[PDB]
Amino acid sequence: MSVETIIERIKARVGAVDPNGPRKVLGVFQLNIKTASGVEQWIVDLKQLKVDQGVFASPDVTVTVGLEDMLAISGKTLTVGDALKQGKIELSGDADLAAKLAEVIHHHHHH
Ligand SMILES: CCCCCCCCCCCCCCCC(=O)O
Ligand SMILES: CCCCCCCCCCCCCCCC(=O)O
């Protein structure tokens, strides 16, 4: 139930995205999860819908979230909306590109 379990859900979703929901998008996301030994970098592209480790040469958006914060969402226990207000996720670059994504996250549980 670590960062691996959190991303495991994304990598599966990104490669499972349906043309009925979203649409041909473009850009990149830089997810940063806090840790006891530092922070884990991640690159989430929207052009081809994929995910990678580390940091991109220059992401269009930079997301900053803590471990507990992520586990809360991916754990289906909490919603991005709540954490959003609390200030769990930081916005760097284009709050739109990031906010738009959360839209797909804020939904019914069990997923
Ligand atoms: C940096 C934010 C944390 C990780 C983001 C989880 C990504 C979930 C799946 C991405 C695709 C969902 C949006 C559909 C349109 C698209 O982006 O192609
Ligand atoms: C600023 C808006 C961006 C919203 C990003 C939500 C915080 C990071 C991603 C949350 C956990 C995502 C892991 C599972 C995939 C999903 O269901 O979204």
How many whole angstroms from 104 Cα to the centroid of ligand 2? 9
Rounded CA-CA distance 69/80 in Å is 9
Elucidation technique: NMR
- CA separation for the pair 94, 82 (Å, rounded): 20
Q: Kindly state if the Cβ of 49 falls inside 6 Å of ligand 2.
A: no
Q: Is residue 101 within 6 Å of ligand 2 at its C-beta?
A: yes
Which backbone phi and psi does 70 adopt, to 5 degrees? Answer: -65, -55
Q: Which domains does the chain have, with CATH numbers?
A: 1-111 (3.30.1050.10)
> What are the residues whose beta carbons fall under 8 Å from the beta carbon of 50, sequence distance 6 or more?
11, 14, 15, 44
Residues in the chain: 111
The atom number, within ligand 1, closest to the CA of 103 reads: 13
